[PDB]
Design a protein around this ligand. Structure first.
Ligand SMILES: CC[C@H](/C=C(/C)[C@@H]1C[C@@H](OC)C[C@H](O)C(C)(C)[C@@]2(O)O[C@@H](C[C@@H](OC)[C@H](O)C(=O)O1)C[C@@H](OC)[C@H]2O)CO
Ligand SMILES: CC[C@H](/C=C(/C)[C@@H]1C[C@@H](OC)C[C@H](O)C(C)(C)[C@@]2(O)O[C@@H](C[C@@H](OC)[C@H](O)C(=O)O1)C[C@@H](OC)[C@H]2O)CO
Ligand SMILES: Nc1nc2c(ncn2[C@@H]2O[C@H](COP(=O)(O)OP(=O)(O)OP(=O)(O)O)[C@@H](O)[C@H]2O)c(=O)[nH]1
Ligand SMILES: Nc1nc2c(ncn2[C@@H]2O[C@H](COP(=O)(O)OP(=O)(O)O)[C@@H](O)[C@H]2O)c(=O)[nH]1
Ligand SMILES: Nc1nc2c(ncn2[C@@H]2O[C@H](COP(=O)(O)OP(=O)(O)O)[C@@H](O)[C@H]2O)c(=O)[nH]1
Ligand SMILES: [Mg+2]
Lengths: 424, 426, 426
């Protein structure tokens, strides 16, 4: 049967993973003590065990998981630990400390694969900017590529925001990650914290958020992406289809991920929440989950994942309407720029949560030239930093070389050029 | 994993250290007899970062107490938490240091240092994964300055891939506490420039300002000043000892705060600091805390931060708070006042958050600033030193211990180079 | 039919033996007083393989307990199952062996061996059809090594057409337990090469690895290690004592596992071995069990099996399982990783299955591997021995008992020949 393996790497990734697992449990009625095959590997005592890899170089987040509510759910191995974190240092992830743990991780992955009779591939959770999530993740991905080749390697990545950050070596790390996951990862789905905060401010009418809320939101999106593997419905999408439909050229593979309706209990009753409306919301500039205007960019390819009550006719109508709008610009070379997925199973509400129950929800994954601007900004930042050789002694002092940075910059430039070409 | 070894040297170093050990003890629910009386499992989970466990659920700080004279350490032992320390971890000489760096570094201290190193080695061998060393001392005396520097040199030579961080009490522009202070400070600073990964610069005048202007305290004791310093110290390592949303680390902070290897002198701050009279009058919001943090009046160095630019600042928040709010506040500060932040490093502010707040507070924060304004301190020290050295005033006390003029000139050169470097980014 | 006589010699041999007799007793439903309290007729059907019946439904193990010093056997008697043994089957001397093979083999042991042989003869006379002998000892000491070897020599001379199999605890590459270990081991191994039909090679370091890495056991006791060994031992003879789909036998295993007469040194393994924390997390499938079995981390010798090739492996499965599945798994291992199996012996894996699983498990398995990697152990021993012998270090203790240099050289020669033979098939 259809089976996939999750990998959660870092602090952020692990946090996201916790939320995801909670959501999954809520969906499939599994208790916190383990009392589906797609995600939960079943054993001979009416016990369901997640099929995930949990990795951190700092033993803190993992320790929390091990002590908390869902400790009996997880295996005592899936949760892997180290001794000291990378500390926002790609070099300490990719070269120095990662090559101590990576083997174990690989072994675990192999074991998990062995336990499956049709592994669709991988879902990986990391962060552009973090020390572990940048370098270690990259290393892992390379190894996976070497091993499996034609198994799906999907990534969920926390992109650094333009006007806000939490680390002053974040441009370097991200750039390095981009350089060394450009020839491995098939899809890298993007979420941005600033964007999420903006969404919270606007749609939810909440202006005192925290990381937990963000994680929950991310988990919803993840669930939507993966809902076709675990339930019936017209147009059952696969993990392998995304690659086919959202990657026109192999270097160009960063699509944005957005969710609608993200709305509180008060204006759920006021709104109709029809299909068309939701679709419209999905394409609105402010509702997007990154800091980019899709008015400044042409949509190459979009993928829509309707979940709940949806008459396909209505969906079609909505799509037609979207096409009609002047705006919402598409590229010349992609007329058919839509993929549609439908599930009978509705979204699931998490107790003590932000979101209310809905009849129908939609998740949109869109690959566009709007991200080019973001990339350019990042490059500029990098240039500003690297011109004075700031922080370079840390990276060079653990493995890296002067020249690698230059190469990375060149690669970024090439990517930008490609994007520009696509735009024409 | 992540054990930290503490070294406290000389009078000030031992005194501050005593207070620090008190504070940490109370945070971990450890009583003076080494017994745990906490209410949360979080209290013990990472207790190994600062403490070693012994028979009968006894916890013993990984602390090494060093002095060339016995008085101060005798007082420490007599003190409240004094009985918590391992007796074998008191290492002392018999002759004083006479506020003389040469005696601390080359002669009296040289005779004692091997014994200290042996104890250090013993402690490091008990670490599953030693993170590094924390030192507490003054820069203006003989023991903390000369002996302390010497110890640092030795340990870095033996453990060059570990973190070496110091809390260093420096002389104050108005009211010096010894006559040879400039000489001692310059001699220490020379060594620290090359042998430490980070140094927190504490100025007693700034502490007095905090006590009088901010805390409204008519009669501050050294004890009270020490408390403040201890609070700042605890802040730095909070993310090793407790859970959080953004788990910081010493190394992480170093990575984000040191853009060039020699520029590792930080101005520490702490918040909130509010008078006992005006407690109910303040609303304890993250914005207000941020404002306190960035206020020059709430800094602990002898600088006007507005007379320079911030290369990087690290903020560590403690308690429950909205990450959204924190980030927004950080953005607002930088956008509004971009002139006070070096333009070649976008996102000059790094934030960390630890869920467990210190006793008696719902929220707190610790501020660590790498500002080009620090050059003023160095420049002033250099001026003072030169004023003396050009007349070879007081120099016979040092030449008599085997030091040469050339060393002093080297020290001066280093200082000036450092100042020049700082001026570059100013 | 198919009676097995057990001999346990020296300290380690007696200790392991005690545990083995406990385990077998529990398997057969025999309590420490020799009373049967089982629930199945299968428990008694072949009880005669290990036990002798006495008046009042008493069962007495066919075990001979041998030592040159009384301490260990006094402890055994004091122990839980100690009262089950026949008092007349304790054969002991008065003077110790001083970790000295010569004392065990030529002098002290020579004085005692006739008495042991008499007991052995007496036991063999009570066998309707004696299959053979099982010996438990260490290779590094004096009694188990020297005396034990001597006994083996005697019995093979008298019963040359019976099976002679040993569980032999060998020295470990990191942490030797005696200084003369290389000498003793080499002297024993020389004799075992020519006088035993099969030897199971147990390494205490491997056991510790199993306990720490696999079982997650913070504080393993020798008792716990012994338990594991006993489990492996029981596995080997399971098919004599219970029904099955493929009824194995000692002789059958020998036939399939020894392609050349001198290559009879096996690496044993056992499965499943899982931490008490992570029990519900594992699905107990035959495939997973197979994977455990073939994992180097689950072996009990001081070898990296990946540094050699398997000449033959025998797997004995216990519990209910699909023969289809078992065969398929075996095929998959060989096809996938044909490089780790000697190419001149098609179907390198032999499988046996016994229906009745051990207590507390639905399925289990025991692994027996004849790998060319074993040469590493021998090579390392030889290196050590030569390092000493070339300086005649410690040699006077042996020459004083009448041994000559020539014997040592002969032993070395044998060892080297064995290594060369192993290298042939590598
Ligand atoms: C066939 C004889 C045999 C030779 C090999 C290579 C065999 C084959 C496979 O097992 C049957 C390996 C196996 O499929 C796994 C990958 C699941 C795995 O178990 O491999 C080991 C490492 C591997 O050696 C590399 C192992 O030690 C071993 O012995 O492997 C790590 C482990 O971490 C959980 C896990 O990742 C020696 O007897
Ligand atoms: C037939 C007449 C007879 C002659 C012989 C040799 C007889 C035959 C057998 O007994 C019937 C021996 C017997 O089968 C045993 C081996 C079990 C055993 O009993 O032998 C003796 C030693 C043996 O002499 C060597 C004995 O003293 C003896 O008299 O043996 C040790 C004893 O230790 C427990 C045990 O090992 C004299 O009357
Ligand atoms: N959405 C979300 N973002 C997070 C979370 N935790 C961290 N981040 C973001 O991730 C980035 C920091 O990377 P981390 O994952 O914390 O770093 P790490 O992978 O643990 O690497 P090191 O700590 O450097 O070893 C920042 O942009 C954070 O805002 C989380 O729980 N949710
Ligand atoms: N903050 C603080 N400063 C101190 C303390 N004790 C001494 N000092 C300061 O330390 C400097 C004197 O050095 P001291 O440590 O006493 O000399 P040493 O024993 O030779 O190292 C002066 O600047 C004093 O103001 C203390 O307990 N707290
Ligand atoms: N596994 C195991 N090894 C043992 C035990 N007792 C001793 N040893 C090992 O046996 C060797 C020492 O030989 P020992 O049997 O005590 O000497 P002997 O009485 O002269 O044969 C060493 O390698 C010990 O580690 C035991 O109970 N179990
Ligand atoms: Mg981390």
């Amino acid at each position: 049967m259809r089976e996939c393996i999750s990998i959660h790497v870092g602090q952020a990734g692990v946090q996201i993973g916790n939320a995801c697992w909670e959501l999954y449990c809520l969906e499939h009625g599994i208790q916190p003590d383990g009392q589906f095959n797609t995600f939960f590997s079943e054993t001979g005592a009416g016990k369901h065990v997640p099929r995930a890899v949990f990795v951190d170089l700092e033993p803190t987040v993992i320790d929390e998981v091990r002590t908390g509510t869902y400790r009996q759910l997880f295996h005592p191995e899936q949760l892997i630990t180290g001794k000291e974190d990378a500390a926002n240092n790609y070099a300490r992830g990719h070269y120095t400390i990662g090559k101590e743990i990576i083997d174990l991780v690989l072994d675990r992955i192999r074991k998990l694969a062995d336990q499956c009779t049709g592994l669709q591939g991988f879902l990986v959770f990391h962060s552009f900017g973090g020390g572990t999530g940048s370098g270690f993740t990259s290393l892992l991905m390379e190894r996976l590529s070497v091993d499996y080749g034609k198994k799906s390697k999907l990534e969920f990545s926390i992109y650094p925001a333009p006007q806000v950050s939490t680390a002053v070596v974040e441009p370097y790390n991200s750039i390095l990650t981009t350089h060394t996951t450009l020839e491995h990862s098939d899809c890298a789905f993007m979420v941005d914290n600033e964007a999420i905060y903006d969404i919270c401010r606007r749609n939810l009418d909440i202006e005192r958020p925290t990381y937990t809320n963000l994680n929950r939101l991310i988990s919803q999106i993840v669930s939507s992406i993966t809902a076709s593997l675990r339930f019936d419905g017209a147009l059952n999408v696969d993990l392998t289809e995304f690659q086919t439909n959202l990657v026109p050229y192999p270097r160009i593979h960063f699509p944005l991920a957005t969710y609608a309706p993200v709305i509180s209990a008060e204006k759920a009753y006021h709104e109709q929440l029809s299909v068309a409306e939701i679709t419209n919301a999905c394409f609105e500039p402010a509702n997007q989950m990154v800091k980019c205007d899709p008015r400044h960019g042409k949509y190459m390819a979009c993928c829509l994942l309707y979940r709940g009550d949806v008459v396909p006719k209505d969906v079609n109508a909505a799509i037609a309407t979207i096409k009609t709008k002047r705006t919402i610009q598409f590229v010349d070379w992609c007329p058919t720029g839509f993929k549609v997925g439908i599930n009978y199973q509705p979204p699931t509400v998490v107790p003590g949560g932000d979101l209310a129950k809905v009849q129908r929800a939609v998740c949109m994954l869109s690959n566009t030239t709007a991200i080019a601007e973001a990339w350019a900004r990042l490059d500029h930042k990098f240039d500003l930093m690297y011109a004075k050789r700031a922080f370079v002694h840390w990276y060079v002092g653990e493995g890296m070389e002067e020249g690698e940075f230059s190469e990375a910059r060149e690669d970024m430039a090439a990517l930008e050029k490609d994007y520009e070409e696509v735009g024409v | 994993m992540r054990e930290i070894v503490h070294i406290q040297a000389g009078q000030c170093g031992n005194q501050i250290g005593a207070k620090f050990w008190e504070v940490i003890s109370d945070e971990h629910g450890i009583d003076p007899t080494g017994s745990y009386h906490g209410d949360s499992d979080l209290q013990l989970e990472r207790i190994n970062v600062y403490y070693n466990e012994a028979a009968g659920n006894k916890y013993v700080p990984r602390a090494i107490l060093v002095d060339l004279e016995p008085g101060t350490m005798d007082s420490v032992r007599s003190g409240p938490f004094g009985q918590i320390f391992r007796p074998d971890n008191f290492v002392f000489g018999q002759s004083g240091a006479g506020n003389n760096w040469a005696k601390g570094h080359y002669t009296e201290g040289a005779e004692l240092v091997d014994s200290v190193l042996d104890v250090v080695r013993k402690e490091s061998e008990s670490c599953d994964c030693l993170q590094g060393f924390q030192l507490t001392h003054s820069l203006g005396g003989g023991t903390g300055s000369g002996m302390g520097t010497l110890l640092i040199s030795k340990i870095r030579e033996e453990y060059p891939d570990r973190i070496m961080n110091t809390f260093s009490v420096v002389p104050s522009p108005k009211v010096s506490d010894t006559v040879v202070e400039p000489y001692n400070a310059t001699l220490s600073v020379h060594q620290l420039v090359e042998n430490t990964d980070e140094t927190y610069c504490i100025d007693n005048e700034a502490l007095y300002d905090i006590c009088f202007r901010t805390l409204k305290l008519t009669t501050p004791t050294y004890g009270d000043l020490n408390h403040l310093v201890s609070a700042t110290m605890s802040g730095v390592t909070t993310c090793l000892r407790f859970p959080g949303q953004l788990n910081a680390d010493l190394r992480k902070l170093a990575v984000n705060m040191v853009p060039f290897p020699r520029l590792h002198f930080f101005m520490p701050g702490f918040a909130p600091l509010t008078s006992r009279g005006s407690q109910q009058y303040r609303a304890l919001t993250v914005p207000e805390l941020t404002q306190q943090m960035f206020d020059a009046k709430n800094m602990m160095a002898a600088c006007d931060p507005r007379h320079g630019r911030y290369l990087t600042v690290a903020a560590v928040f403690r308690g429950r708070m909205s990450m959204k709010e924190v980030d927004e506040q950080m953005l607002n500060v930088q956008n509004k006042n971009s002139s006070y932040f070096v333009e070649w490093i976008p996102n000059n502010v790094k934030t960390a958050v630890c869920d467990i707040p210190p006793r008696g507070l719902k929220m707190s924060a610790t501020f660590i600033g790498n500002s080009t304004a620090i050059q003023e301190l160095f420049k002033r020290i250099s001026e003072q030193f030169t004023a003396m050295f050009r007349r070879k005033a007081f120099l016979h006390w040092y030449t008599g211990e085997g030091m040469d003029e050339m060393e002093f000139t080297e020290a001066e050169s280093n200082m000036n180079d450092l100042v020049s470097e700082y001026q570059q980014y100013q």
